[PDB]
């Protein structure tokens, strides 16, 4: 029996190129977790109290999305690699500039799994593309999310009262077409 | 063991400067009540029945803080003071000028806790600084609140359609960001 | 009614020595949230489950401590800046280094609240020094907490089977002198 | 409608390397069940009560796997072939010794299905990848279970104080890292 280079029993050796990858998508959704605290804070600044509950999750879960690749690693016998956090963006003309830059960064996020993806095919590596396969799920079921709350908010058109209203659905926990 | 000014044993001595401060704080806390309440009346001559609601309660939370006081000034076995109470201000031109005042009445009364907890501080007392902490807890927390409905009422502009929305998420006891 | 720097209704203006120091409060209670995540790691990769689990939670709560600041800036109408986080330490010798930099880093959050605390007494900020009342407070149990974990792992003087009985209270939530 | 080998209904047919491949992993699971049990016998003989109840288990449940492959070529039409079954290793000259080997069968029942899994890649058989898609996770958390029971086993060193602690954590079911 072999051991990897975390020190643990070691399963299938992983290439480097993927491994690193991986390490690199793990920053990806760490950034995406400060982007999210950012917007809430931007929302809880403006009184959008759905919108800063709403954002406020969003930055948990990322956080935890993240914590599940770390396991990820740990599991397959491979360090990890905690890499500086980029401070985010913090400013925004409008609530519908914001929800276009969070559209954004799922859409990001996810295409930064596909590229691992990508790497784990190219690899041969099955355990990497059957783990990542759910998050890919959840990532449509993200896109499909963030794509709802940016076009309702875009469908208000800057009106104060219909953006009070998607406030107040957002604080309900109405956030997907259902 | 010595009496103090109100007959009970007296535990510690009081400046008479801050006897005074603490006194005259009680009458700003009275005064808030019937700002408030005056506020209550003006919400309800318009049919804003949830700011109506909202403002009863807080002419109501106003005047047991006050009392508060007054039970603290016995337990240091001090004389209270109950003074002569100025009407309120009862004419505003909007919701967004009504919400301006009442901000600024809260921020006031925090300032006034800021002034007698600076004498207890120069004199030493401090039981009265213990005693007013948990109390500026409290007001940090209203301040936020104050600035959240003021906030969402200036988001507003004016459109009587957000006003009705707001004036039923307070109804609903809606009236802080979460 | 005037508006603060982040654009709310202002109580009281804030010294920019104090918000910059919070500013970087926040910083630090991020980094020890990462830097607890990199210690869950480091102790999941020895298969000390249990430590791997208390580190887990702690970084969660550090991330929560982190973003309660956020809301007290939000809450004093100030602007929050996010900023860049440094990569964690990721490599100890032994878990009692780890429990060492643990405590140290316990210690150092404390003495950042601390460094706040002092600016904000000389700037007779009375609404900061009561929102750090009982954080402090929480430090007193953290310390005494980590203390308590340190001890009882340099008890153990590098024994493997006094480890794991230590690593099965903490996997049992006995962390703490009760 | 054809008839597939076995005799059902042929949704579509199957290459007979596909089939020949999937009928000798199943013979690789039936030979890890015995195997375990072997393994659990030998933990029974020196009174490992903990660690003879977890393998007791995994040989039940390697046979269970086994079993759901025998299924899908029944669902597939497909002929199953029951193959000899040799003798498991028996003898070990230590539980940490013992503990490699349940190791590396994980991993090579693993590097079974991923040959599985190749082949139907090349076959287009895509019945056949989201069939094994599920399998490759349970096995990523096997061999994450398995090497934290390495692992752990390991740590102690062969004290007996510290197998004894581990083997009353196999009891209680305490056989992850949660
Ligand atoms: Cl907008
Ligand atoms: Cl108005
Ligand atoms: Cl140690
Ligand atoms: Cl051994
Ligand atoms: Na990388
Ligand atoms: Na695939
Ligand atoms: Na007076
Ligand atoms: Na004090
Ligand atoms: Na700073
Ligand atoms: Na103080
Ligand atoms: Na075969
Ligand atoms: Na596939």
Redesign the interface.
């Known amino acids: 029996?072999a051991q990897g280079p975390?020190?643990?029993?070691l399963?299938?050796s992983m290439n480097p190129d993927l491994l690193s990858a991986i390490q690199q998508h793990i920053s990806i959704e760490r950034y995406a977790s400060?982007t999210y605290?950012?917007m809430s804070?931007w929302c809880?600044?403006?009184?959008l109290?759905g919108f800063?509950?709403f954002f406020?999750g969003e930055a948990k879960a990322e956080?935890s999305h993240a914590?599940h690749f770390?396991?990820?690693l740990?599991?397959?016998?491979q360090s990890?690699?905690?890499?500086?956090?980029?401070?985010?963006r913090?400013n925004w003309d409008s609530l519908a500039s914001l929800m276009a830059t969070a559209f954004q960064m799922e859409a990001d996020t996810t295409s930064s799994i596909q590229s691992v993806y990508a790497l784990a095919e190219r690899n041969?590596d099955?355990?990497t593309t059957?783990?990542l396969?759910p998050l890919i799920e959840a990532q449509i079921q993200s896109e499909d999310q963030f794509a709802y709350l940016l076009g309702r908010v875009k469908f208000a058109n800057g009106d104060?009262?219909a953006?009070?209203?998607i406030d107040?659905e957002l604080?309900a926990g109405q956030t997907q077409r259902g």
């Open positions: 029996v975390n020190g643990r029993a399963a299938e400060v605290l950012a804070i809880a600044e403006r009184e109290a800063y509950q406020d956080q914590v770390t396991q990820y740990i599991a397959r016998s990890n690699d905690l890499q500086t956090l980029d401070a985010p913090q041969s099955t355990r059957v783990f396969d104060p009262t953006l009070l209203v107040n604080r």
